[PDB]
């Protein structure tokens, strides 16, 4: 019997990196738009890199943060493609997790022969009531010792709701 | 020959001491200065506007002005003989109340008080200070010991 340590999803982050700019990026923005239903933020280059074809302050990726129920509704319909199974080393040291997909169509999406197939990074920030203590402005603070989601609490999170196997071996 | 620049040799004066790098505690500009009050200059890095300068870092002078956030202050500065009583316009941050005067004031308040009293007696009280006299004949006593014998101790080479 726990009061409100309802381990629950604070956010779902969708990034679509594509070291290009212009088209091949601008189209990727419509995928997140379509999938989420919110205008995604264009990221840009921290600084220039030569082997890559990217330049400081050039646009590269496009990314979103999805939250509330519509996070649940894209995590579910996310893993599904990864048939409710992940690996041991994605359950991270701070109680977050991450599962990437290969192709954006597999999430109930229509392919246009123009708008190709850019998968995406899904990651999710598990939280808990009273995790906004840090992020607020007045009377900020830190989140206890417990109240911090350990790797192994984030594991049997994912194992008792999406009921995945979480297969070992790296 | 060296550079005349206003802040030479200040590398390690104006430098704030330790673990005080930051917000200037507010008290230090919410105590009141007023003309006649004697004040010790003490330059400070943090604020650079209205700085004094090294040739009077650590001097004292009386105040002759008071502007919105600064204090015009008359200080004596020695210069190949002729000392010059001269006036500068230092921002509050670099200034304190010297407690120099404040032994006297407490000595005055006591003497006027001790003179008004013991006037109804007419007994003459020792008002002036007086330097530390020679320590008076006292006795000592050991009780039931002789004193302890010292010997200088034999040198051996430690390393």
């Amino acid at each position: 019997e726990n009061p409100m340590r309802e381990l629950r999803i604070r956010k779902l982050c969708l990034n679509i990196c594509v070291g290009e700019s212009g088209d091949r990026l601008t189209r990727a923005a419509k995928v997140l738009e379509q999938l989420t239903g919110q205008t995604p933020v264009f990221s840009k280059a921290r600084y220039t890199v030569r082997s890559f074809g990217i330049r400081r302050n050039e646009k590269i990726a496009v990314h979103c943060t999805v939250r509330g129920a519509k996070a649940e509704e894209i995590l579910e319909k996310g893993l599904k493609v990864r048939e409710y199974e992940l690996r041991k080393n994605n359950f991270s040291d701070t109680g977050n997790f991450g599962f990437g997909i290969q192709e954006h169509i597999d999430l109930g999406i229509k392919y246009d022969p123009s708008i190709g197939i850019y998968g995406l990074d899904f990651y999710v920030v598990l939280g808990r009531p009273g995790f906004s203590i840090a992020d607020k402005k007045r009377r900020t603070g830190c989140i206890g010792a417990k109240h911090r989601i350990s790797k192994e609490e984030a594991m049997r999170w994912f194992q008792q709701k999406h009921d995945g196997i979480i297969l070992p071996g790296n | 020959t060296n550079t005349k620049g206003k802040r030479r040799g200040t590398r390690y004066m104006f430098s704030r001491p330790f673990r005080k790098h930051g917000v200037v505690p507010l008290a230090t500009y919410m105590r009141i200065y007023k003309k006649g009050d004697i004040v010790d200059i003490k330059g400070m890095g943090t604020v650079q506007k209205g700085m004094p300068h090294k040739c009077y870092h650590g001097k004292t002078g009386r105040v002759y002005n008071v502007t919105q956030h600064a204090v015009g202050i008359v200080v004596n500065k020695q210069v190949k003989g002729k000392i010059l009583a001269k006036r500068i316009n230092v921002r509050i941050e670099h200034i304190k109340h010297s407690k120099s005067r404040d032994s006297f004031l407490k000595r005055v308040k006591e003497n006027d008080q001790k003179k008004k009293e013991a006037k109804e007696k007419g007994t003459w009280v020792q008002l002036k200070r007086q330097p530390a006299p020679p320590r008076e004949a006292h006795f000592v006593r050991t009780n039931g010991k002789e004193p302890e014998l010292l010997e200088p101790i034999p040198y051996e080479f430690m390393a």
Partner: protein
């Protein structure tokens, strides 16, 4: 492994911030610029009206700043307002008015000025700005203190201000942030401040919610149902308050004496009592494993 960031060195060199910083409560730079009084004044104070909307209760108080610790001359909270016929919804912009109004009048009862610079009475929601009367005690003034509230248009803070201005303090306030300013035009409606002052925000939420769905009413505001408060009524609770406050602002306290006075913290352990616990162990340990 990694390098341990938090060495001995981390803590030999870590220089604390500056207490009311750690707690995270105070612009001091900005307290600096608010508070410290010019030195063409030496003693005379600088008053600031302090408003921080908490979360349950709005606190407003006039303070002046001394070297031992800023002294509060007058303090008016929101949880007083039951006295003045306002039971509920008392961290709400319209109650910050009454609170700030209270404050202005609890102050102005002292230095005997409740008979002058009343400010606006019927309430409009405009420029009211007090003009000191000649041959009288000149009006009171203070430079509003927001604290840490991102002061966008509509926020309660500079709204409670409107209360203390309306109540007869001469604060420099502009109108650019009162709920009503149009940020694509640059005027008032002012008749939006009408509402915004008297809580027909809350009335019209108490009416969009009700006809759509029941039991979101009651959930969203139970105590707005309980205490037999309604819309329509609302406007004419508050108007009894900015009247009732103004006929009697003064605080009467409540006298206090009883407490038995038990000590139900926990105390500091004395030296010897730590001194043994290590000697108490190490005899619990030694004994335990001189065996198995």
């Amino acid at each position: 492994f990694v390098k341990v960031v938090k060495n001995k060195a981390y803590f030999k060199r870590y220089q604390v911030k500056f207490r009311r910083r750690r707690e995270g409560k105070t612009d001091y730079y900005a307290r600096k610029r608010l508070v410290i009084q010019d030195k063409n004044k030496y003693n005379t104070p600088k008053y600031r009206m302090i408003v921080r909307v908490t979360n349950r209760d709005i606190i407003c108080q006039i303070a002046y700043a001394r070297i031992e610790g800023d002294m509060i001359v007058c303090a008016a909270y929101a949880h007083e307002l039951p006295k003045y016929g306002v039971k509920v919804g008392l961290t709400n912009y319209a109650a910050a008015y009454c609170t700030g109004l209270l404050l202005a009048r609890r102050l102005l009862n002292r230095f005997g000025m409740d008979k002058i610079y009343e400010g606006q009475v019927e309430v409009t929601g405009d420029e009211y700005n007090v003009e000191s009367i000649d041959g009288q005690p000149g009006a009171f003034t203070c430079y509003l203190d927001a604290g840490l509230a991102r002061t966008t248009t509509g926020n309660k803070v500079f709204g409670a201000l409107k209360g203390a201005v309306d109540g007869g303090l001469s604060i420099p306030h502009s109108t650019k942030r009162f709920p009503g300013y149009d940020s694509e035009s640059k005027e008032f409606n002012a008749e939006v401040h009408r509402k915004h002052i008297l809580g027909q925000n809350v009335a019209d939420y108490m009416r969009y919610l009700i006809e759509e769905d029941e039991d979101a009413y009651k959930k969203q505001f139970s105590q707005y149902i309980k205490n037999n408060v309604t819309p329509d009524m609302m406007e004419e609770m508050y108007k009894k308050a900015h009247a009732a406050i103004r006929e009697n602002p003064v605080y009467e306290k409540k006298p206090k004496k009883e407490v038995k006075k038990k000590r139900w913290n926990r105390p500091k352990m004395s030296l010897a009592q730590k001194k043994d616990r290590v000697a108490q162990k190490k005899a619990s340990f030694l004994r335990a494993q001189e065996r198995a």
